[PDB]
């Protein structure tokens, strides 16, 4: 008889969707999670989606259907999924088991509506919903540890025991890449420049990704930057204008450790890691300290691993072994973990089938996916 | 009798342990798989499961028939769910297993899957057994 | 009276990728589904199993006569799952299906396998004619990339008064097997 279709894997982020086929080692498609609409003035269509909204962002206002990892606009999110299946992957959703990802502490009603839409609107044969941080851990070749998932809209500390996230100790932080980009725009403007537009915002995002780093000793790096020019780097804008950036390089991602830079009065990611660990079962805490896993684009700053080793070291007992693992592939480790999980021999029993959904209803997601 | 449920839960070969326990007035293990763990649930273990201190066992863990387990999810007293998911704790790399405890009007339904079996499958099975007995005012 | 006369070979898709297109054309003519998926499934073929074998014929290009997919079997090192066995529609009834399955047995046995497994409903007699028997369900192992981790006391009320023999649409299917 015909072989069964390979499962799809769709990691829905606040800024980027990553979609591909279970078993591959990298998504086939990575595109922005946006829907654009005409600013003022048929035009062509009522709305523009993903790669298309990106190419037309000059005449458009952009909406992010996912805010801080949570889906908030369901009609536009539906448009995103349609784009993923038919435009980006070019597959028939009714033919493939579909593995979706969700943010830690995703509200109950949200994952119910996720299951409902996938089954009733896209007619999937079967599906599953996995926590993004858990997939990242699987990608690191592990099933227990604490993950630091910092993307574009949200940062989470997720402690995981034997592949099961421990919600009671998850820690959420509404600070991520997009906020850092905004912060760099702000202080670059304080340096004499003018980055204030959405387009200029994308430009600053590239500046941030290509020249920022985390200082190991912040106050000592500030002194070096005030004493010399060794840390200053330049950046060529698309119009040939050239700007130069100094201590901003490491002031920007320093926000992760000192949210007060952006006016937030909350703990830095090191303090949140520690609190998360301390809310967990005593017997597993040592395994947490030795399996600190980083995922998300915002953890790709040069120097972040060494710095959080240092800070965690200083927060944790004097005998604790602490290890910070930053796979080179962690922009996409959540997706890779989904590929892994959906390819495992143990997963065939885990799918929610069209027939389980007919009998039990959307509530079934709360029983099979955690 | 009640043992006809242990088998009705053991029939699909997905679980290595199962039990029905009374938690009202004075807890007793009504039915369980012989020679396994749940058969030896002590009244103090029940009391912790159904007690009010829904916070300590997160950092202290808990025990079921003496087996150390870690708490993953706790909805055991919240209406509509009445469920609790756990994962056992082992020493020296020995395998661990997923546990689900559901609560009805008078009984605690406990299931421990065998190696590799996902906790969401055990949760579904336990939830369906509990819904059946709630449907029968148990 | 089905004596194939054409010169035929049996080669993995991933060693003749210029024929992958022709193979997808072949299978999707029998089981229509998205061409993106069929091309991907054939693109997973590898020496690590799953691998797709094409029955090919010399003579502009070579013809893709038939195809069968071979996967490894969970907990059964010596078993292979056979799926998606199809001969080109215009070439059925010439013995190419018998040669395809017999070539599968040779290929598998050379590599140390000793049991083939497959599912069918309407073609049960085609397989019994070639020696297959009714067996029990197996779980095939899907493709994982080389680059992935690869490290992973009141009385009781009344009672409520193997989905492996069912397939994608809820039909019953025969599990058949063969020693080789
Ligand atoms: C339906 C399911 O669930 S599993 C189905 C497996 N795959 C398919 O059905 C794809 C569509 N069908 C096909 O591709 C082809 O018909 C095949 C692969 C099944 C057979 O290939 P063909 O070239 O048509 O058959 P072929 O010419 O090789 O005949 C070989 C022998 O098998 C016999 N045979 C062929 N088809 C059948 C059949 N459906 N039932 C019983 N015997 C058959 C022939 O009589 C012949 O006998 P002989 O060689 O001992 O004298
Ligand atoms: N090399 C880099 N250095 C610094 N930041 C980077 C780098 N590459 C990507 N980023 C940042 O990562 C963010 C996107 O990461 P990611 O795709 O993990 O987020 P997401 O999953 O879309 O959103 P969520 O926060 O909901 O997970 C962007 O804000 C971008 O600025
Ligand atoms: C290259 C790239 C990176 C990214 O993370 O894409 C996301 C999604 C994007 C959507 C608008 C942009 C014009 C469209 C595509 C850019 C996609 O918004 C971001 O740029 C946001 C706004 S600024 C920032 O730092 N993150 C990041
Ligand atoms: Ca994410």
Dig out the tokens for C137 from the structure.
């369900």
Strands A171-173 and A155-161: antiparallel
Residue A294, C-beta contacts closer than 8 angstroms, at least 6 positions apart: A147, A148, A150, A304, A305, A324, A325, A326, A327, A330
Q: What does DSSP say about strands A98-102 and A126-131: parallel, antiparallel, or unpaired?
A: parallel
- Return d(Cα A152, Cα C57) in angstroms, integer: 54
Cβ pairs bridging B and C (under 8 Å):
21
SS3 for A226?
Answer: helix
Radius of gyration of chain B (CA): 14
Taking a C-beta distance cutoff of 8 angstroms, is the pair A11, A132 a contact? Answer: yes
Contact B8 C156 (CB under 8 A): no
3-state secondary structure of B34: coil
Q: Is B28 on the interface with C (CB under 8 A)?
A: yes
Please tell me what DSSP assigns to residue A88: I
Q: Give the residue ranges of DSSP H helices in chain A.
A: 50-55, 74-82, 108-120, 132-139, 177-189, 198-211, 218-227, 248-254, 269-278, 282-289, 304-315, 333-343, 354-360, 364-368
Q: Is C94 known as a binding-site position?
A: yes
Residues of chain B contacting A280 with CB distance shorter than 8 Å: 58-59
A47 sits in which H/E element = none
Q: How many CB atoms lie within 10 A of CB B63?
A: 17
Residue of A237, A209, A360, A230 whose CA lies nearest to A298:
A209
Q: Which residues of B113-123 are buried (b: 16+ CB within 10 A; e: fewer)?
A: beeebbbbbbb
Task: Among the bound ligands, name the one nearest to the CA of residue A102.
Answer: 4
Tokens of A243: 């700007």
Strand arrangement of the beta sheet that strand C63-73 belongs to: C9-12, C51-57, C63-73, C76-87, C115-120, C174-179, C133-134
Q: Which fold has domain A177-262?
A: Actin; Chain A, domain 4 (3.90.640)
| Whether B74 and A169 lie within 8 Å, measured CB to CB | no
Paired strand residues for C9: C56
Q: Closest Cα partner for A155 from A143, A171, A135, A138?
A: A171
C159 lies within 8 A of chain B by CB: yes
State if residue A75 touches ligand 1 by the CB under 6 angstroms criterion: no
Structure tokens at C65: 């006569």
Chain-chain contact of C155 with B1 (C-beta, under 8 angstroms): yes
- Could you tell me the distance, in angstroms and rounded to a whole number, from the CA of residue A202 to the centre of ligand 3? 6
Contact across the interface for B120 and A370, Cβ inside 8 Å? yes
Enumerate the residues of chain A whose CB falls inside 8 A of the CB of residue B84: none
Residue C124: list chain A partners with CB under 8 A: none
Q: What angle do CA C61, C63, C69 make, to 5 degrees?
A: 130
Q: Which atom of ligand 3 is nearest to the CA of A62?
A: 11
Q: Measured over all CA atoms, what is the biggest interatomic distance in chain B, rounded to whole angstroms? A: 44
- Chain C nearest-CA distance from A91, in A, is 6
Pairing between β-strand C174-179 and β-strand C115-120 as defined by DSSP bridges = antiparallel
- Residue C53: closest CA among C93, C29, C20, C79: C20
Three-state secondary structure call for residue C84: strand
- Asked if residues A211 and A246 have their Cβ atoms less than 8 Å apart, the reply is no
Third-level CATH fold of B1-138? Beta-Lactamase (3.30.450)
Helix (H, G, I), strand (E, B) or coil at A74: helix
C-alpha–C-alpha distance, residues C61 and C21, integer Å: 12
Classify residue A136 as exposed, middle or buried by CB count within 10 Å of its CB (0-12, 13-18, 19+). Answer: buried
- Give the Cα separation of A15 and A108 in Å (integer): 22
**Could you give the CA distance from residue B129 to residue C13 in angstroms, rounded to a whole number?**
49
Nearest residue on chain C to B25, judged by CA atoms? C153
Calculate helix-pair angle for A177-189, A198-211, nearest 10 degrees: 100
| Listed residue (A348, A325, A345) closest to A136, CA to CA | A325
Min Cα–Cα distance to chain C from B29, Å? 10
- Residue of A31, A62, A152, A182 to test ligand 3 pocket, by largest number of atoms within 8 Å of CB: A152
Query: How many structural domains compose chain C?
Result: 1
Distance CA B109, CA B31 (A): 10
Phi then psi dihedrals of residue B19, to 5 deg: -170, 150
Q: Which residues of A210-233 are buried (b: 16+ CB within 10 A; e: fewer)?
A: ebbbbbeebeebbeebeeeeebee
Q: Buried b / exposed e across C67-82, counting CB within 10 Å, b at 16+?
A: bbbbbbbeebeebbbb
Residue A337: count other Cβ atoms within 10 Å of its Cβ.
28
Preceding omega of C51 cis (within 30 degrees of 0): no
Does ligand 2 come within 6 angstroms of the Cβ of A268?
A: no
Alpha carbon distance A354, A363 (integer Å): 13
Q: Any bridge partners for residue A149, and if so which?
A: A156, A295
Burial label for C158, CB within 10 Å (0-12, 13-18, 19+), is exposed
Lookup: tokens for A43: 């035009």
CB-ligand 2 contact for A253 (6 Å cutoff)? no
Using the structure block, give the residue that is written with the tokens 């990802």. A101
**Does residue A79 contact residue A47 with C-beta atoms inside 8 Å?**
yes
Torsion of CA A253, A258, A260, A263, to 10 degrees: 30
C41 annotated ligand binder? yes
- Alpha carbons A191 and A29: distance in angstroms, whole number: 37
Which residues lie closer than 8 Å to A83 by C-beta, 6 or more apart?
A31, A49, A50, A51
Task: Spell out which residues of chain A touch residue C144, defining contact as CB-CB under 8 Å.
Answer: 23, 340, 343
Alpha helix (H) ranges present in B51-118?
56-60
State how far residue C158 is from chain B, nearest Cα, in angstroms. 8
How big is the CA angle at A250 (ends A249 and A252), to the nearest 5 degrees?
85
Looking up tokens 């339904």 gives B109
Domain boundaries, chain A: 4-34+66-129+332-366, 35-63, 131-176+266-327, 177-262
Residue C135 C-alpha, separation from nearest chain A C-alpha, in angstroms: 15
On the CB side of A177, how many CA atoms lie within 13 Å of its CA? 27
Confirm or reject: Cβ of A12 under 6 Å from ligand 2: no
- Give the structural domain span for C125: 1-180
Angstrom CA distances, C158 to A200, B19, B21, B28, stand at 70, 17, 17, 21
Region at A317 (left for phi over 0; alpha for psi -120 to 50; beta for the rest) = beta
Q: Could you give the CA distance from residue B99 to residue B113 in angstroms, rounded to a whole number?
A: 7
Q: What CA–CA distance (Å, rounded) separates B74 from B85?
A: 7
**Cα(A334)–Cα(A337) distance, rounded to whole angstroms?**
5
Residues of C with CB under 8 A from a CB of A: 27, 30-31, 33-34, 36-37, 40-41, 44, 69, 71, 74, 83-84, 118-121, 139, 141-149, 151-152, 167-168, 170, 173
Residues A216/A309, Cβ–Cβ less than 8 Å: no
DSSP tag of C15: G
Query: Which structural technique was applied?
Result: X-ray
CA angle at A28 for the pair A64 and A141, rounded to the nearest 5°: 95
Q: What is the dihedral of CA A217, A221, A222, A226, to 10 degrees?
A: 160
- Which helix (H) or strand (E) element contains residue A24? none
- Residue whose entry in the numeric block shows the structure tokens 């395998």: B95
Cβ proximity of A276 and A170 under 8 Å: yes
Name the closest ligand to CA A199: 3
- Nearest by CB to residue B133, choosing from C153, C155, C157, is C157
Q: Which residue CA neighbors atom 24 of ligand 3 most closely?
A: A178
Residue A193: other Cβ atoms inside 10 A: 17
Query: Which value, to the nearest 10 degrees, does the dihedral of the CA atoms of residues C69, C71, C76, C77 take?
Result: 110
Query: Left (φ > 0), alpha (ψ -120 to 50) or beta: where does C124 sit?
Result: alpha
Q: Confirm or reject contact between B22 and chain C (CB < 8 A).
A: yes
How do strand C63-73 and strand C76-87 relate by DSSP bridges?
antiparallel
Q: How many residues does chain A have?
A: 370
Question: Rounded to the nearest 5 degrees, what angle is found at the Cα of C91, between the Cα atoms of C86 and C95?
Answer: 80
CA dihedral C42, C48, C53, C58 (to 10 degrees): 100
Q: What CATH architecture applies to the domain A35-63? A: Roll (2.30)
- Which positions ≥6 away from A289 have C-beta within 8 Å? A277, A312, A316, A320, A321, A322, A323
Domain positions in chain B: 1-138
Q: How many residues does chain B have?
A: 138
Phi, psi dihedrals of residue A257, rounded to the nearest 5°: -95, -20
Candidates 3.30.420.40, 3.40.50.1000, 3.40.190.10, 3.90.550.10; correct CATH number of A4-34+66-129+332-366? 3.30.420.40
Across A13-134, the runs of DSSP E, i.e. the strands, are: 16-21, 29-32, 35-38, 48-49, 60-63, 66-67, 70-71, 98-102, 126-131
Task: State the CB neighbour count (10 A cutoff) for residue B59.
Answer: 17
Instruction: Quickly list DSSP for A154-189.
Output: -EEEEEEETTEE-GGG-EEES--HHHHHHHHHHHHH
Sign of CA dihedral A137, A140, A144, A150: negative
CB contact under 8 A, C160 and B28: no
Two tokens, residue B8: 């009705």
- The encoded tokens of residue B86 equal 């756990």
Distances from the Cα of A4 to the Cαs of A72, B76, C22, C142, in angstroms?
34, 38, 20, 10
- C-alpha distances (whole Å) from C53 to each of A244, C7, C43, C161 are 58, 16, 12, 49
CB A196 within 8 A of CB A171: no
Of A281, A257, A261, A285, the residue nearest A269 (C-alpha) = A257
Tell me the CA–centroid distance for residue C148 and ligand 3, in Å: 28
Phi (first) and psi of residue C127, to 5 degrees: -85, -40
Long-range contacts of A362-365 (CB under 8 A, 24+ apart): A362/A112, A362/A113, A362/A115, A362/A116, A363/A112, A364/A115, A364/B124, A365/A111, A365/A112, A365/A114, A365/A115, A365/A129
Subunit contact A164:B81, Cβ cutoff 8 A? no
- Residue A36 · residue A57 · CB < 8 Å: yes
Q: Other C-beta atoms within 10 Å of A310: how many?
A: 15
A window 349-368, beta carbon within 8 A of B: 349-350, 364, 366-368
Q: Whose CA is nearest to atom 25 of ligand 3?
A: A178
A305: its two tokens: 């691993």
Torsional sign, CA A111, A115, A118, A120: negative
Closest-CA residue of B relative to A282 is B59
CATH number for the domain whose boundaries are A131-176+266-327: 3.30.420.40
Beta bridge partners of C117: C81, C177
Read off the tokens for A319. Answer: 């005998």
Closest Cβ–Cβ partner in A4, A23, A140 for C144: A23
| B58, B81, B123 ranked by CB distance to A281: nearest | B58
d(CA C175, CA C180): 17
A335 closest CA partner among A13, A27, A14: A27
Residue C15 Cα distances to A286, B57, C107, angstroms:
49, 57, 15
Resolution (A): 2.9
Cα separations (Å) of A306 from A292, A303, A313, C58? 12, 6, 10, 61
> Looking at the DSSP assignment, which residues form a beta bridge with residue A182?
none
């Amino acid at each position: 008889d015909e072989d069964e279709t390979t499962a799809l894997v769709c990691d829905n982020g606040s800024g980027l969707v990553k979609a591909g086929f279970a078993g591959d080692d990298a998504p086939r498609a990575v595109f922005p999670s946006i829907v654009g609409r005409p600013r003022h003035q048929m035009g062509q269509k009522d709305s523009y989606v993903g790669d298309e909204a990106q190419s037309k962002r000059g005449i458009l206002t952009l909406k992010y259907p996912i805010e801080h990892g949570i889906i908030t606009n369901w009609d536009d999110m539906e448009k995103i999924w349609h784009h993923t299946f038919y435009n980006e992957l070019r597959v028939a959703p009714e033919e493939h088991p579909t593995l979706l990802t969700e943010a830690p502490l995703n509200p109950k009603a949200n994952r119910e509506k996720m299951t409902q839409i996938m089954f009733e609107t896209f007619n999937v044969p079967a599906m599953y919903v996995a926590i993004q941080a858990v997939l990242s851990l699987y990608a690191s070749g592990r099933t227990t540890g604490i993950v630091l998932d910092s993307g574009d809209g949200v940062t989470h500390n997720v402690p995981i025991y034997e592949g099961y996230a421990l919600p009671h100790a998850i820690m959420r932080l509404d600070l991520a890449g997009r906020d850092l980009t905004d912060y760099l725009m702000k202080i670059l403007t304080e340096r004499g420049y003018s980055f204030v537009t959405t387009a200029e915002r994308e430009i600053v995002r590239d500046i941030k990704e290509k020249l920022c780093y985390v200082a190991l000793d912040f106050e000592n790096e500030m002194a070096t930057a005030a004493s010399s020019s060794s840390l200053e780097k330049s950046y060529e804008l698309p119009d040939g204008q050239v700007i130069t950036i100094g201590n901003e390089r490491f002031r920007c991602p320093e926000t992760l450790f000192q949210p007060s830079f952006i006016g937030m009065e909350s703990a830095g990611i090191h303090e949140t890691t520690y609190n998360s660990i301390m809310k967990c079962d005593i017997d597993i805490r040592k395994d947490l300290y030795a399996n600190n896993v980083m995922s998300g684009g915002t953890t790709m700053y040069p120097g972040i691993a060494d710095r959080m080793q240092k800070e965690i070291t200083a927060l944790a007992p004097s005998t604790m072994k602490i290890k910070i693992i930053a796979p080179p592939e962690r922009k996409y480790s959540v997706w890779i973990g989904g590929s892994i999980l959906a390819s495992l021999s143990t997963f065939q029993q885990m799918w929610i089938t069209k027939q389980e959904y007919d009998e039990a209803g959307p509530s079934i997601v709360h029983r099979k996916c955690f | 009798g009640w043992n006809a449920y242990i088998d009705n839960l053991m029939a699909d070969g997905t679980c290595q342990d199962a039990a029905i326990v009374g938690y009202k007035d004075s807890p007793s293990v009504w039915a369980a798989v012989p020679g396994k763990t749940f058969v030896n649930i002590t009244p103090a273990e029940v009391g912790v499961l159904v007690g009010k201190d829904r916070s300590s066992f997160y950092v202290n863990g808990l025990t079921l028939g003496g087996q150390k387990c870690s708490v993953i999810r706790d909805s055991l007293l919240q209406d509509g769910e009445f469920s609790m998911d756990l994962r056992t704790k082992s020493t020296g790399g020995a395998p661990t297993f997923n546990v689900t405890v559901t609560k009805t009007d008078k009984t605690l339904v406990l299931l421990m899957g065998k190696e590799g079996v996902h906790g969401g499958l055990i949760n579904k099975k336990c939830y369906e057994m509990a819904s059946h007995l709630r449907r029968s005012q148990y | 009276g089905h004596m194939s006369l054409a010169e035929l070979t049996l080669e993995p898709v991933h060693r003749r990728p210029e024929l992958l297109d022709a193979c997808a054309d072949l299978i999707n003519d029998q089981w229509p589904r998205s061409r993106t998926s069929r091309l991907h499934s054939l693109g997973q073929s590898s020496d690590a199993f799953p691998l797709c074998l094409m029955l090919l014929s010399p003579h502009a290009a070579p013809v893709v006569v038939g195809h069968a997919r071979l996967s490894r079997v969970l907990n059964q090192p010596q078993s292979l799952l056979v799926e998606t066995v199809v001969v080109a529609r215009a070439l059925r009834g010439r013995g190419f299906g018998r040669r395809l399955m017999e070539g599968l047995e040779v290929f598998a046995r050379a590599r140390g396998f000793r049991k083939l497994h497959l599912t069918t409903h309407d073609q049960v007699h085609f397989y019994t004619h070639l020696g297959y028997q009714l067996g029990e369900p197996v779980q095939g192992l899907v493709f994982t990339s080389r680059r992935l981790p690869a490290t992973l006391l009141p009385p009781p009320p009344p009672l409520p008064e193997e989905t492996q023999y069912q397939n994608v649409r809820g039909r019953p299917i025969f599990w058949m097997e063969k020693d080789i």
